[PDB]
Design an enzyme around this catalytic site. Sequence first.
Site, PDB file in Angstrom:
ATOM      1  N   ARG A  20       0.797  -1.216   0.000  1.00 24.38           N
ATOM      2  CA  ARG A  20       0.000   0.000   0.000  1.00 24.38           C
ATOM      3  C   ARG A  20       0.835   1.273   0.000  1.00 24.38           C
ATOM      4  O   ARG A  20       1.992   1.278   0.418  1.00 24.38           O
ATOM      5  CB  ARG A  20      -0.981   0.007   1.178  1.00 24.38           C
ATOM      6  CG  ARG A  20      -0.331  -0.257   2.524  1.00 24.38           C
ATOM      7  CD  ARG A  20      -1.217   0.182   3.686  1.00 24.38           C
ATOM      8  NE  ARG A  20      -2.380  -0.679   3.877  1.00 24.38           N
ATOM      9  CZ  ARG A  20      -2.319  -1.899   4.400  1.00 24.38           C
ATOM     10  NH1 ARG A  20      -1.150  -2.405   4.767  1.00 24.38           N
ATOM     11  NH2 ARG A  20      -3.424  -2.616   4.546  1.00 24.38           N
ATOM     12  N   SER A  44       9.699  -4.889   4.316  1.00 21.32           N
ATOM     13  CA  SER A  44       9.763  -5.989   5.284  1.00 21.32           C
ATOM     14  C   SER A  44      10.731  -7.111   4.923  1.00 21.32           C
ATOM     15  O   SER A  44      10.329  -8.270   4.806  1.00 21.32           O
ATOM     16  CB  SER A  44       8.374  -6.588   5.487  1.00 21.32           C
ATOM     17  OG  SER A  44       7.529  -5.686   6.175  1.00 21.32           O
ATOM     18  N   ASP A  65       9.109  -3.594   8.993  1.00 16.16           N
ATOM     19  CA  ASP A  65       7.753  -3.525   9.540  1.00 16.16           C
ATOM     20  C   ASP A  65       7.727  -3.657  11.061  1.00 16.16           C
ATOM     21  O   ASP A  65       6.872  -3.066  11.725  1.00 16.16           O
ATOM     22  CB  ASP A  65       6.796  -4.519   8.863  1.00 16.16           C
ATOM     23  CG  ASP A  65       7.296  -5.954   8.906  1.00 16.16           C
ATOM     24  OD1 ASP A  65       8.467  -6.177   9.272  1.00 16.16           O
ATOM     25  OD2 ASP A  65       6.508  -6.864   8.561  1.00 16.16           O
TER      26      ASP A  65
HETATM   27  O1  LIG Z   1      -1.510  -6.991   7.288  1.00 19.56           O
HETATM   28  P1  LIG Z   1      -1.593  -5.528   6.925  1.00 19.56           P
HETATM   29  O2  LIG Z   1      -1.731  -5.290   5.438  1.00 19.56           O
HETATM   30  O3  LIG Z   1      -2.549  -4.749   7.788  1.00 19.56           O
HETATM   31  O4  LIG Z   1      -0.135  -4.929   7.269  1.00 19.56           O
HETATM   32  C1  LIG Z   1       0.363  -4.828   8.603  1.00 19.56           C
HETATM   33  O5  LIG Z   1       0.875  -6.090   9.028  1.00 19.56           O
HETATM   34  C2  LIG Z   1       1.870  -6.610   8.146  1.00 19.56           C
HETATM   35  C3  LIG Z   1       2.356  -7.966   8.636  1.00 19.56           C
HETATM   36  O6  LIG Z   1       1.276  -8.892   8.689  1.00 19.56           O
HETATM   37  P2  LIG Z   1       0.792  -9.687   7.380  1.00 19.56           P
HETATM   38  O7  LIG Z   1       2.038 -10.320   6.805  1.00 19.56           O
HETATM   39  O8  LIG Z   1      -0.215 -10.660   7.951  1.00 19.56           O
HETATM   40  O9  LIG Z   1       0.194  -8.613   6.498  1.00 19.56           O
HETATM   41  C4  LIG Z   1       3.052  -5.656   8.074  1.00 19.56           C
HETATM   42  O10 LIG Z   1       3.997  -6.168   7.129  1.00 19.56           O
HETATM   43  C5  LIG Z   1       2.593  -4.261   7.673  1.00 19.56           C
HETATM   44  O11 LIG Z   1       3.708  -3.362   7.698  1.00 19.56           O
HETATM   45  C6  LIG Z   1       1.501  -3.814   8.638  1.00 19.56           C
HETATM   46  O12 LIG Z   1       1.012  -2.514   8.299  1.00 19.56           O
HETATM   47  O1  LIG Z   2       7.021  -9.333   7.681  1.00 22.27           O
HETATM   48  C1  LIG Z   2       7.561  -9.867   8.889  1.00 22.27           C
HETATM   49  C2  LIG Z   2       9.025 -10.267   8.680  1.00 22.27           C
HETATM   50  O2  LIG Z   2       9.123 -11.247   7.634  1.00 22.27           O
HETATM   51  C3  LIG Z   2      10.457 -11.749   7.638  1.00 22.27           C
HETATM   52  O3  LIG Z   2      10.546 -12.890   6.818  1.00 22.27           O
HETATM   53  C4  LIG Z   2      11.305 -10.639   7.041  1.00 22.27           C
HETATM   54  O4  LIG Z   2      12.611 -11.132   6.745  1.00 22.27           O
HETATM   55  C5  LIG Z   2      11.360  -9.490   8.049  1.00 22.27           C
HETATM   56  O5  LIG Z   2      12.110  -8.402   7.516  1.00 22.27           O
HETATM   57  C6  LIG Z   2       9.931  -9.051   8.400  1.00 22.27           C
HETATM   58  O6  LIG Z   2       9.960  -8.218   9.557  1.00 22.27           O
END
Ligand SMILES: O=P([O-])(O)O[C@H]1O[C@H](COP(=O)(O)O)[C@@H](O)[C@H](O)[C@H]1O
Ligand SMILES: OC[C@H]1O[C@@H](O)[C@H](O)[C@@H](O)[C@@H]1O
Lengths: 899, 899
Positions: free
Chosen positions: A524, A588, A642
């Site tokens: 996003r 991330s 993240d």
């Molecule tokens: O999940 P979101 O899009 O609300 O995103 C939120 O959580 C993510 C992790 O969780 P997942 O891998 O389950 O998305 C993060 O990477 C992201 O920065 C955060 O804003």
């Molecule tokens: O998204 C959660 C995590 O995923 C891991 O596999 C990435 O290497 C990290 O940089 C990140 O914080």
Amino acid sequence: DDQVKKIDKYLYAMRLSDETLIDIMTRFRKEMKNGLSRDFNPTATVKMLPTFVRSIPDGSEKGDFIALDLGGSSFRILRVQVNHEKNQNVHMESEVYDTPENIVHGSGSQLFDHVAECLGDFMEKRKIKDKKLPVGFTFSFPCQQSKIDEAILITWTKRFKASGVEGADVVKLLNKAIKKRGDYDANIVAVVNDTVGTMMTCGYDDQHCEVGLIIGTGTNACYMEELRHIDLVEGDEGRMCINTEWGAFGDDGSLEDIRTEFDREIDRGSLNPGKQLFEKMVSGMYLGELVRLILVKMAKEGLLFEGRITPELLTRGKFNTSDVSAIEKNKEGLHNAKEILTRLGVEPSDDDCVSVQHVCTIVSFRSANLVAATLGAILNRLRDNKGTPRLRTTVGVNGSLYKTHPQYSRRFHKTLRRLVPDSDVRFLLSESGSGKGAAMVTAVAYRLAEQHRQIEETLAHFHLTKDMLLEVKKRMRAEMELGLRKQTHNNAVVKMLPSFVRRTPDGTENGDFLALDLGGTNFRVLLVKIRSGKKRTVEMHNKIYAIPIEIMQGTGEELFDHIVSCISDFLDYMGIKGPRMPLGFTFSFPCQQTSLDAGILITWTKGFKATDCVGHDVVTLLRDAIKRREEFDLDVVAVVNDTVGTMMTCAYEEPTCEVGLIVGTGSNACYMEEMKNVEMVEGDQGQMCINMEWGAFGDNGCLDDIRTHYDRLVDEYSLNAGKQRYEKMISGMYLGEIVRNILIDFTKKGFLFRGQISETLKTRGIFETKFLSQIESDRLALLQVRAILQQLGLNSTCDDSILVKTVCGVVSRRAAQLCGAGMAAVVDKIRENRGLDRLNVTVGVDGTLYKLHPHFSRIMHQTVKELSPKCNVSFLLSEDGSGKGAALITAVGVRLRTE
Amino acid sequence: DDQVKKIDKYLYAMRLSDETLIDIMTRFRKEMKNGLSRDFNPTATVKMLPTFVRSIPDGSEKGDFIALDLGGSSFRILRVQVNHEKNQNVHMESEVYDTPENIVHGSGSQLFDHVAECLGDFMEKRKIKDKKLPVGFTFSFPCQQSKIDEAILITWTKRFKASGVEGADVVKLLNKAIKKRGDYDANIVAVVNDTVGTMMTCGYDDQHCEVGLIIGTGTNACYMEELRHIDLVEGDEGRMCINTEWGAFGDDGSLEDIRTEFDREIDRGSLNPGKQLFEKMVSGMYLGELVRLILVKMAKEGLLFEGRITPELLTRGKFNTSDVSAIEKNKEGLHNAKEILTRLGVEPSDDDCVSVQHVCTIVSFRSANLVAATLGAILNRLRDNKGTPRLRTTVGVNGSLYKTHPQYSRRFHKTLRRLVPDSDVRFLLSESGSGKGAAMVTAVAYRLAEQHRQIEETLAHFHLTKDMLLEVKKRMRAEMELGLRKQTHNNAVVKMLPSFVRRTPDGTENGDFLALDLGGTNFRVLLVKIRSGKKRTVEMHNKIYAIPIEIMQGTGEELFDHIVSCISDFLDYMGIKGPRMPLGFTFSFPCQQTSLDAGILITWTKGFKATDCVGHDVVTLLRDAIKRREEFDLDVVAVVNDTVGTMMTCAYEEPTCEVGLIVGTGSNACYMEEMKNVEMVEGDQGQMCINMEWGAFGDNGCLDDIRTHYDRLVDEYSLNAGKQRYEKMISGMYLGEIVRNILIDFTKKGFLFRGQISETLKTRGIFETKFLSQIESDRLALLQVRAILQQLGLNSTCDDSILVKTVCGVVSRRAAQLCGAGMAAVVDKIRENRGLDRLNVTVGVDGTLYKLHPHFSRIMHQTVKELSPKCNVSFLLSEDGSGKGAALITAVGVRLRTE
Ligand SMILES: O=P([O-])(O)O[C@H]1O[C@H](COP(=O)(O)O)[C@@H](O)[C@H](O)[C@H]1O
Ligand SMILES: OC[C@H]1O[C@@H](O)[C@H](O)[C@@H](O)[C@@H]1O
Ligand SMILES: O=P([O-])(O)O[C@H]1O[C@H](COP(=O)(O)O)[C@@H](O)[C@H](O)[C@H]1O
Ligand SMILES: O=P([O-])(O)O[C@H]1O[C@H](COP(=O)(O)O)[C@@H](O)[C@H](O)[C@H]1O
Ligand SMILES: O=P([O-])(O)O[C@H]1O[C@H](COP(=O)(O)O)[C@@H](O)[C@H](O)[C@H]1O
Ligand SMILES: OC[C@H]1O[C@@H](O)[C@H](O)[C@@H](O)[C@@H]1O
Ligand SMILES: OC[C@H]1O[C@@H](O)[C@H](O)[C@@H](O)[C@@H]1O
Ligand SMILES: OC[C@H]1O[C@@H](O)[C@H](O)[C@@H](O)[C@@H]1O
Ligand code: NA
Ligand code: NA
Ligand code: NA
Ligand code: NA
């Protein structure tokens, strides 16, 4: 003839009308529905107890089993051996042990010490002590059962009153008695009622047998009921045997109009006053004594033996059912009556022997009639279930009274038929008694128990002990140290990457920032407006843009061209195209950073694998894509993980928040470390947020200790084999695959899905975070579970749904515990850096698995508390996403630079 | 024409046919069934939430109320007055408080602080801060509610996104913010959805109103559903309003075949991605934006404005649903379009205005059609519930889109009525808003809350705090001292009578013994054979004899003649009348004893009142009755209290069993005390079992502190007014009466049984131990409770059943705790007397209440453990009866005189 007309009218009450029998019967039909209803069961007198026997033997049963039989006239022990494969035909030996009224009435100890000793001896004779025969257990008493190998004694009946047994598990009690001897071993695989054992015995020979009947010391009946009618058992599939326990019929006054002064007195003198009322009018433990009472009454009134009465005629139990029988015989009856009555001290005449032999007839005839009333109720039930107009079935039978009495059988049948016209019923008399049926049960029960043991052995590898977790904590801490110290950092698997964010928000952050969120489930672009001062506010806007999988694994140029294209669109969207705005880039993935605005991609993780990206500065890659499109211009101020972005988001309002945790697609954590410890960044003043990248924990093999066959399959077939091992045991991208592989294994073993691996089960990614979370929801009906599965493509039965659910729970539980062990290491390090005895600290968390799963966060929290008792950790949910924090980080970035 | 043709085929996916609509309607039909099912609900996206509103206004509502309205386009606070009385029947004044985006998107704390502040300002101006105005709260978001004054936010929707609110009770959050201000008080008695408020407001004017509908910022609907269809709310009586939350229809992908690319893009830029997908195709918040997205797609493809595109056109929110309405004017339609498009920087040609207008037409028409399909499902649902061929009902409606759009209402109605043929439907627009309906709910909620308050006040007198219980213990201890010291004995209420049993069984007891058991629920005569030495066994039989009530209250002459009449019958029963057997006499009433075989009845207790017994030696009375019949003769060796007998029965096995407890018809306890403390019997060597007769505890007023109005009624109407007060708060003969008197009280107040005191409720004894135990049984069905009560003679609704159960529980709980404080005093005395820092002792227990009650024993044990920490007490349950312990006492007795 007045000799008979007289008594008949005197014992008027004990001569039941056919119309009366019909009423009784109708009333038992109701009592059955009450026992089967989940609403009325707790109040019903007829407990309709489920037995967990699915059907009569088919002839597939094979093996060697031992069977116990207690609660009947004799405490027997058998050995049944069957193997049609080898053409061994059902064969069985047996032996009866002596058991004095003393034991039957002593402490639960004595009793079960006696049983454990008798089994020890029975096995010593055949010398089967060595060897591990499965033990069956016929226990002719109402029992609470949640599984076939469990029996909580609801209440003693008949001749037993043993202290400390009612409300206890007789299986456990027996076991305890055995182990106390250490003489041998015994695997009690099952416990059945004698009605059930009898049904199974006749079922073995008669494929129509749907009923089990016992009319001996006590009385009771079992039968095959539909699962769709057993409210107290989850399922609609097939049928199950239900032990009605009709002895207690009327224990609540239901039959007060039928009982007589004689039944009430026998009751008052009984071992279980007020209970087993219907039975106290029927079984052969009471019949004889009921007669002796009717006589005494008459004799006192002079109707017998002239007016004579002796101390024997008044002594309890001087008149057996043996006598009721011996006196019932056709040619030797009266001659016997004479002998028995004579030994009673009285001077019985030939007129007396005729009167007495008739009392035995009225008492004997009533019992048979009552049973015909209730058994008729069962049959009606059956014919109903089948839907057939007429009914044809077999009724297994047993019990001293039914066997020995010379008029009982013949009478009972006749009356039953009359009561139930449309029933074509055959009565098969168990000869081996309960034993063969018991063995046929034990066989099926042992077979199922073997699977369970195997399933449990496999799943046990996912169980981690308090100590194992402390070791994990300890290994995490050791790895952290290795990643921080520069002399060892290059080989450390847990990189401890510096983020160059030295502090959490100080409330001076102000301005308009752009932000990217790339690496999670949603890519996003954001616009974040931060205003400080007396009136501090945050205003943000998001737009999710998709990234086609092709592109996600295409080239570096493509990827960032797409990103920049999406930024372009968003700038149009927010109506902010033109000015050069600062941008926080939440990326991330592990990045080596030399400053806040530079990050070189160390390696791809999760599902990302674009070419010509690893080894590049992702800020450079972005800037290039921006220049190439040459529409607008951006000022990329920072690249942020993240974890870090999330911690800052939560820290905004919670100043105690110094830890970031992500449990979503991937899993990783960050925390505020002392600069004097970050040997990789020059300076030992203040603090620095460290992006641990703890997913790579175990990449050097430090976890091969706890990784399973299934973890290795998942790792081995991943996009990044050998990497992110810790993460692969925790995060939502992988948990499903672990579960899937377990199910594939179990199916091949024949424990699941008829042993047929569907194309669906071979599809990777099938068990998404969303499904795992739904599956594990609490108090969820198996029916719903089966629905979820079938809706994925997996056609499973109730049993399958249970197993699958158990598997999901074990995998996710372990993920929560492992995650907690890591967090435990983290907070404890913080505590020490601060030189505290106790530490209060909050963790800012995000991730779809963490948010959706019904147990993960709970178990993870409990684990952290358990493993680091000197820390009080608060977990704070991020509801704004990483962008907010990224923006807050970009603000400080713009200021600092502007110096 | 040529124009409309093109657009029509370009947006074909949004032109919904009636066949499709009927399909969608059937889909919603099923979704409703899933939301209502206890099995499918956890996975249903249409939540079908209970509102706890049983019906629309019935005209009995009146009072002065304050109402809050949050979640619509305006945060509004109102004051509603309804009186009969005055008219103006309904009068209301309101105010709209500014609520900027910052508040709606910030922290939950900030949001509710804002609300609390506004509520304060509102109350200040009207200077009503001092009045007790009940507050109703319209909160237009899906909430989990177990009661009307609770509202746990499931998820934010529409424009709101405030952190720390989802999963929390907004009622608590608001009170919290209110208490922080310390500005005023606020009695929030009810929370309602805006659909519900709408239904109630319209229902006020139209008694056919059965649906509340909103089509404004968001879209939703509620309706009256039968309780028999609401699985998540126990009950089958009447109806309850159901909040469907139909905005989330399709969130599981059920509508993906209906949603277009435009719907998907709207979502990606939304505040709640992936949620309320149905709503996002319908409500005013989205229709405009949805149009803009389409204009952009067309402009780009050349289909509009020569292909021209402006920054304003590409900007989020530039095309409001307000423009959609205006452009659909009859009217200035094409004219309005000209101006709107001209402000967007585009160069609109007259054809552009026509094209645009037709776009607005497709979008807005689809909205109305979708709503008609889902509403149709509800209408069809209402009809099936009635079981009639036709349906007549009124639908309450509100919402800006529906109120302001020039075509929507008309189209929505036409399509709806077409989809549901056999139904006459009135759409009544709520002009006054939700406030009036909210106030209507508030009136009933308040009225009910008042009843709850009174009920809770009353029951609160039965609650005993840890500290109170410690006092009871302390007072019990003092009373024990008084009873033991001879200088205070005569005036002591707890008599601590000597039993002249100095030691627990030593294991050498041996021989045959007769026993008598009088004073419990069962009178019986027992035969006990105790073989000791190398092998020790105990064989015992017994018979129960009734004692006709008159006799129980006739003359000592008749009572003991009967007793002996039975003893003789039993001797015959055991067939052993000749020898002068030694007999143990269990007489469970206070007896002043000088020896083991001398017992002077001090007073009658429980239900006994035979004349000329009190003041006599019960042994002398028995020896006489025996001598009068002259039939035979026996040797009464001892008279024992059931507590002492019970202790001895349990101490036969357990050597640490030095205490007896009875919680049955009556309640009492004994224990082994040191002669040094038994000041009333000469000597200070060895121990002596003391029958406390603790039931009389409180007879000197020492418990007047905790005795309630109901305790006093029970005591004052008893056979022994002023005596056995403690016992009257504990045992099975009394607890039922306490409950009964509370129920009568509540019934007069009109809280129970429609305020009708039945003849049954006026019958004493109705709540016997057996019933009290059934009704409190764990996880028992409410239906089961109502059944039991109904079978007693009490017509009870499900609510009634709830209260009666609650009452029984409060009474039994106090009884268990009070008993626990008594035992805690006893054991802790033993400990202190034996100068121990910790004591381990077991207590022999017997009594029907204790054996049958589902919680008594558990709670009692807990209290003992809490109040006497330095003590570890084990509770051994007696299953043999007191007879056994009596025989053990006889044994030692018979030996002592010869020896
Ligand atoms: O999940 P979101 O899009 O609300 O995103 C939120 O959580 C993510 C992790 O969780 P997942 O891998 O389950 O998305 C993060 O990477 C992201 O920065 C955060 O804003
Ligand atoms: O998204 C959660 C995590 O995923 C891991 O596999 C990435 O290497 C990290 O940089 C990140 O914080
Ligand atoms: O009768 P048996 O010893 O062959 O034993 C057989 O019948 C008994 C009932 O009849 P009774 O109470 O008369 O024993 C059953 O309890 C027992 O399981 C069965 O093996
Ligand atoms: O619209 P109002 O302020 O009269 O408020 C009225 O309609 C709203 C919905 O429509 P909208 O979202 O368009 O406001 C409701 O939430 C509100 O309870 C009702 O009183
Ligand atoms: O209750 P039973 O007949 O086993 O009798 C047993 O418990 C009674 C108390 O409990 P309740 O007053 O409820 O009978 C005792 O008085 C009696 O000595 C004991 O044998
Ligand atoms: O032995 C026949 C029957 O005796 C009854 O008293 C028991 O409650 C039953 O479990 C048993 O089937
Ligand atoms: O306000 C109209 C509707 O909007 C929806 O978004 C909310 O979830 C409902 O609770 C509400 O009734
Ligand atoms: O029978 C239980 C108890 O009832 C009390 O009311 C009697 O006074 C005691 O003697 C007896 O221990
Ligand atoms: Na079932
Ligand atoms: Na450093
Ligand atoms: Na219900
Ligand atoms: Na003394």
